């Protein structure tokens, strides 16, 4: 039989071990020659592994790279302006990696240019909160000054916003070894560890989902028309910077001022923690300078695009797409992932070789700069959004296929719940002790979830990866899976550092290649069952319980401020009436899906593809009209988080702080009814169609 | 056989007439006691004709009407202060109504409320061009000023914005016997000009789409967050009124100033046209003097939705709709096109009882507060705009069945130019002098189209009517057809006035109800075809063909321009190309839906009905986010009529006069990209999926 079990045993570890060390041998970073050369091979793999159609897709977007001839750093000046303290121009090589040529500097894509001098001011992880105890509390002022922040808790990019509005004129990142040093592992090459010269990459911007900053709304085809850089979307305005931890200890260890305000803003290394602004007396005349002369540029970009003909729904997609572009070798993010898919195609080739075809279309892509703002597939999704619209039953994401080695991660839509359930009891765990054991049992044993005993956890989709035009923008369903660490104990210490290489996954990660099996089954399995099973796998009921848990955390913090609800009649009656609908729609169309032909068959898989559809609101989010889904957008505070009920939640926010409370408990109000009637208008695309 | 024969046949002048005498001898104002009547009236007779379901929806909207005791009027005031001139308190009522209560006076509805007074300057049609000869040519200043104007060319309310643009303090609008008496024929109730004492009613909005004025985007539903007053859509911001020509000739008869610029400027009544300001030596120091004291509140409206459930697609929607709400009797407005749907909705349910279904579901709507801005239709499409996204086929709107009774007109979609050339060649004409001949052959002979010879005029979709929302929203295939008028030789005189009665009708346009009985023959076919042809009766190579006559006009306008096109390198060759795909990806899907199983067949419709869908950008046009079709949108200057390429239209137009030549062309090549994209992506959409 062609079956799932026979797709899910031709994958092979050892297969996806070779595909690994084959992408990780050289930088492959977005827009350079080498990428473009990677994509070539792997359209021409997945042609001869036996896809039906695959093609490059290309655009010219806005990238940012530094100067080869002008470098990047920051110093520390005396009153003379001599540069008494520089850091470094580039991370150590790894050993044998010490001749590759083309390694990117450290750098954070698309700052400004610029060498701005001033006082130091250090905010913590410079999180929304970090700043309102610094201006509200501590009331220290960072107009002006440069700030130094610890990466880690938020994506960068809402770091560079926040500072922006503390009026810096600069931003240094570190890597704290407290958030990037894991107790008793040594430094790499000997351990996982990040080094002192270690230097976490990456991009800076405040996109929103929009993609290519010059383009929004429309592909960056040929013909396209650009805004000018002033009008861009989502560029910072101050130059920014990223350093290890050997030099943040020379920038952190003179800095005088006040005491940090507790202890969770101390790090690990051996500095007072001082919040500034400026150095200690002996030091107060010296400063810290800024240089950075990178540069932004329209550069060509390349996503492959595979096709597996359904032969019975052809015109239903059923998605798989990871990116390719790296910041080094990306050992880990992202080919640990993009080999995985690679392995996935080969295997969905041999069944096609054999007579098989999926029921739906299957499609397979490896995205370009997703490094530089999820700019490939939100320029294709933009191309193509008509299609997606109508034809998009899922999107199965495949970055990086593990961030640790203890057990599984899933984030998805509630549709995709009890799907990932069955899967997984179908699997077999890789864990040490489960032996025999399903990796349901595993998972579910050591990420238990908090609502309900005897299931496992899955996360909401937050952003910071290629599923959020898809999800957020386009409302298809969608999903992703890797295998995490233990999060009793920020991602692991090797991120977008040149040490993440093959030598530390097939040492230190998973030397047996039996995670990334793990992860190719289930990224595989569900890709197989959702472009093969006839009737689709989604469980509307599982969407009817999660709107019951937010709308009671939505309302929980409303409640936060009884007189100002009793004073502008602030209800949520509204809104936990639509889900009070939606339950028992859900459950009547349920009974129906299970008690019901083809058209008939049709009308209701196109009533569960529409589902996820539904809760997009074509005037999107208030200033962020690329995140239309009313249920689920990025948190505002940090794009790798996920926000409920966003509108309301956003519209809550810091509410006590604002002048006019008349106004600001309107725009809750107003919330409410936007919640509530996309709530009820989900609902009713489950009802008997007339 | 239960065919498009049966339908047909059944059919009856005699029922339209009994209909319309039953749904006129009242007013029907929306937001009145009696239309609430007579919507329960329609719901249970289209429950006793046999449709599946008939329900009301009702939505609380903002509406507008005349305080009853502070009567509104405008004065001659002379120095003093006393009013030696008042205009009418009401229409002179038509013989045997004058005992009818609760007709409404002639107002402006949504004025606000004043009593501004003024010198008068007289702006033609106040159309924009108008504007522009007073400014730019003759340099005459409105600003402060009460303007006046007749009716007619543009839809008032892009007359109320215009005055209001050039700072006027009030507006009056008035009907002038060069505009609304037709030479040769008498006044009401002798003939069907109109008298000297009618007046036109009617709204004078700008909502771009918007719905009711306090809940764009959403339902105003019984939750719905209102907007304050201040923050409506589209309300006029200065004192308007509307009186007929004898009014009027007091008013323009001492006018004094400039004379007018020439002979398009001066109407029929015995007065000089002169432009103003002010009036002449003798009575300079005598003003106009406006007293308007209307009210606009939030009112309960109810649409009729009745629904005959589809045997085999009940999941896909054809519409036909129209209003019910009148201004006073609605003899031609809109009760001659709801007697005519109320006889389909029969016909459709006498062979409902013999057994007999549709295809795919048919959709009846009786429309509310239309008048007042196609207020019901834009919030019940608003709440139902999934279903209607996902599911919607076709809209057939079916407002008044008559304007005139000389031959058809058909305003559409270009999808389906060839269903309405094939269903006219099986209809039989009702004019004289082609008894025995099809409607195809009387109607494109005396309405021949510009374009080809032997076939008739269709002309674009402009607005003013309840398919705004489906088409330029929402993308669903629209259309409309009507008898109408010899075009040669402004709409019918006693359009929105008193005098539009059942007698109207009756006596002078069609006193056999041939022609309303022919109208309902072509809408009812029209829904018929496409609720039960088995592949849906469009033909996209029919947009092909007007895509290039479209992007021919847009060009040659630019090309006015030749020395701007060639400094700021403004090329149409991206639309061009993208129109040449289109026509050869068409012609293949024309081949392949010839020469082509349920999945393929619903494949292929999905792809048809989802091509009108393709031309909605989710973005809008610009200020303008409830026009979404890129190809089609009212014009910015005339609501009622219909504009092509839109977004790049609006760019050129008055683009000699704009300050920063380079902004204004920059935005002309960004509108162009829009549109080649918009077109490439509609093509696309008729590839092989896969
Ligand atoms: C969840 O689904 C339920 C359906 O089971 C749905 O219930 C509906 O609620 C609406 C909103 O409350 C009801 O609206 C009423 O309709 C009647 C006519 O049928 C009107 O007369 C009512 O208006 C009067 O009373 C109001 C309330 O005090 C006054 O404000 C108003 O001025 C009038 O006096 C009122 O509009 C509706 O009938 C039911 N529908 C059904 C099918 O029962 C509920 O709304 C859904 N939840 C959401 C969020 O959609
Ligand atoms: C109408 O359909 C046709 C398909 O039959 C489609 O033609 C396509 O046109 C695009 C845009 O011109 C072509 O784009 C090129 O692709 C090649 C790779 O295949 C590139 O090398 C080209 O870029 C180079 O040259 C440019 C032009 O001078 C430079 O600006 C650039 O810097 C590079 O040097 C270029 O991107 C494309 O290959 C064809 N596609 C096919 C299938 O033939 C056309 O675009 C459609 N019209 C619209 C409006 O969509
Ligand atoms: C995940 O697996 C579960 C457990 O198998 C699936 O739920 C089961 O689905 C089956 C098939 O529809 C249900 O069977 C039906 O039983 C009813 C009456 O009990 C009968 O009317 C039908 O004809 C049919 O035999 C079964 O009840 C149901 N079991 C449970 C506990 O819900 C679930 O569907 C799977 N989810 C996905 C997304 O595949
Ligand atoms: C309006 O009526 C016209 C004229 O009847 C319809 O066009 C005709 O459609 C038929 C049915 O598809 C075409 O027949 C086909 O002929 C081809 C080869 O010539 C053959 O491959 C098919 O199997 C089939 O017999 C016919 O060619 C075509 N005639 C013309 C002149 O186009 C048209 O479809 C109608 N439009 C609508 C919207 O219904
Ligand atoms: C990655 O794998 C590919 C394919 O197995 C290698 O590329 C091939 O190299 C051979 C031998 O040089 C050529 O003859 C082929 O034309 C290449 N094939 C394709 C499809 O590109 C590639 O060299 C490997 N890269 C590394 C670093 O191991
Ligand atoms: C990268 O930095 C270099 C080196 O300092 C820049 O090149 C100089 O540009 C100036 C002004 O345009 C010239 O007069 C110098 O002769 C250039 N220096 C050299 C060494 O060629 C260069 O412009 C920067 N590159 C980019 C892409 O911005
Ligand atoms: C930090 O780097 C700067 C720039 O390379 C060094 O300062 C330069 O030193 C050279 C040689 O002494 C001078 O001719 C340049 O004029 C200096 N440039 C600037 C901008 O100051 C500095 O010595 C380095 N500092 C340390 C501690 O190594
Ligand atoms: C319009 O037609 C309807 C229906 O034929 C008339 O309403 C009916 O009136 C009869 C007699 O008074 C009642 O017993 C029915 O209950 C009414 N039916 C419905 C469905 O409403 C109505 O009177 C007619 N109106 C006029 C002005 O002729
Ligand atoms: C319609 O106009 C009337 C009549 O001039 C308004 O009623 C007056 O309102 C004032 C102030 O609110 C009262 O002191 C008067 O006694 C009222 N006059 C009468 C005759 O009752 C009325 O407010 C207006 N109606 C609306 C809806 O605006
Ligand atoms: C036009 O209408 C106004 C208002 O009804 C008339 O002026 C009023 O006349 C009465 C009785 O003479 C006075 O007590 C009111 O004070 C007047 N009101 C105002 C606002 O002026 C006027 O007579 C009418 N004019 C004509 C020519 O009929
Ligand atoms: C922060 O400092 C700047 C300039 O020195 C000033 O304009 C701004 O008001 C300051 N805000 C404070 C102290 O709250
Ligand atoms: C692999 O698992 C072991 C066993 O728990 C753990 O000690 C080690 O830290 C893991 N490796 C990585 C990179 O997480
Ligand atoms: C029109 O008149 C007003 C005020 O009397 C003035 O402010 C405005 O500039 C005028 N414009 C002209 C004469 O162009
Ligand atoms: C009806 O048609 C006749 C014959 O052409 C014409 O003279 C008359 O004006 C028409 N009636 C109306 C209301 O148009
Ligand atoms: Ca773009
Ligand atoms: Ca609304
Ligand atoms: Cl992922
Ligand atoms: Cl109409
Ligand atoms: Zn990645
Ligand atoms: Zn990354
Ligand atoms: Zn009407
Ligand atoms: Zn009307």
Redesign the interface.
Known sequence: KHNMKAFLDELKAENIKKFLYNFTQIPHLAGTEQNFQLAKQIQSQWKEFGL?SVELAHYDVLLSYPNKTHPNYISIINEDGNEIFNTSLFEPPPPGYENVSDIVPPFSAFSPQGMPEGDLVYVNYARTEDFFKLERDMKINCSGKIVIARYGKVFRGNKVKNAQLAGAKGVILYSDPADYFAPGVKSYPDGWNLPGGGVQRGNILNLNGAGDPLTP???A?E???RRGIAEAVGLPSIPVHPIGYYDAQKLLEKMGGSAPPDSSWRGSLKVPYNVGPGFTGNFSTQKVKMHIHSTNEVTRIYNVIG?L??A????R?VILGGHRDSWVFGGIDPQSGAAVVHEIVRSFGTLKKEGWRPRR?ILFASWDAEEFGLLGSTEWAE?????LQ??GVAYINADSSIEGNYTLRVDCTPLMYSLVHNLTKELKSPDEGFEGKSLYESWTKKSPSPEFSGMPRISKLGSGNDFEVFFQRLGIASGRARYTKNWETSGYPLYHSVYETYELVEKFYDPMFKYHLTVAQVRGGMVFELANSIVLPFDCRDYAVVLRKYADKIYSISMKHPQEMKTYSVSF??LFSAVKNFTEIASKFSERLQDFN??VL??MN??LM?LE??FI???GLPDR?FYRHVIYAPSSHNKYAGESFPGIYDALFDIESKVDPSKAW?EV??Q???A??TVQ??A??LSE??
Request: charge should be negative; aromatic fraction near 14%.
């Open positions: 039906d709304g429309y592909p085809n013909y396209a028309y096709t003909r359904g019975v729904e052809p015109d997609y279309t191309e193509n959004s008509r299609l109508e034809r009656d509204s083809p058209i049709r009308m196109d009533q529409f559809r539904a609101d074509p005037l009209p309107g109000k107003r409410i009814y936007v509530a009637f208008a989900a009713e695309t169609v007339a």
